[PDB]
Amino acid sequence: FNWRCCLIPACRRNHKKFC
Numbered sequence: 092f093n094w095r096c097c098l099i100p101a102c103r104r105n106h107k108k109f110c
Contacts, residue, residue: 096102097110 092106092109093102094110096106103110
């Protein structure tokens with residue numbers, strides 16, 4: 092999993108469950 096996504100609103104929005 093790309094934890095960096097949690098730093099990116101666009102990816103964090105989709106991976107809000109992970110982050």
